[PDB]
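Q: Could you fold this chain for me?
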Amino acid sequence: GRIVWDGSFNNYTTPADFDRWSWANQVGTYQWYIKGSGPTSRYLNLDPSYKNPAITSELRGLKVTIDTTATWNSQMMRTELIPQTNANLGQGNLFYHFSIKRTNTNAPDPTLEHQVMFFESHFTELKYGVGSNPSNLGWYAGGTERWSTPFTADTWFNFAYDIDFTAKTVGLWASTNGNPLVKVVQNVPANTFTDSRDFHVGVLRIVNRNPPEDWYVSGVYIEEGPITTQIGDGAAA
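A: Sure. Below is the predicted structure, expressed as structure tokens.
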């Protein structure tokens, strides 16, 4: 359905593009303040190879990097953007889309806990490096893992959070690469409150140390229903 907020990176061509935003000048589509003291290019980079190639409407993807200097409100490793919008991202039934992957370079550490693509309250999020299968990418809702999959290098993992803000439930749509989203977890109860500036597009890791981690993110947006299941122009399916 209609796109409520568009996290396309098409207008974000270099790291400095994220620096245009400030609390006094809330331009563009992303808030950029949850970060270390380093230059933005230490944490956020943009490139055509950083996207899910099946997402044909996008020129590039985002490499999110955490290192030992990525420290904002604590020693935890954090590199996170937040949607910038005047819209209500927390009423009705909305679908929070994104695609994520890792490579073999600066591979996330499966021995350490990560929270990724999370709301402030963690009512839904992805984690890595935790639980029974720490090398799995798990999706959580209401504090409980509902789904997980081996976090295979170079595989593009497509997701949508199917959030019913009225009934206060969240389900999960998922697929890989160019395949269309299928609903893999039916909606489960959670405290779905969002203030519409508290969804964290990025990565938190609790334990701080070298070496760095790269996560890749593309095709980020939030739409009304009915869900768009097709990835890109559908050609890679």
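A (continued): DSSP finds no helices and 15 strands in the chain.
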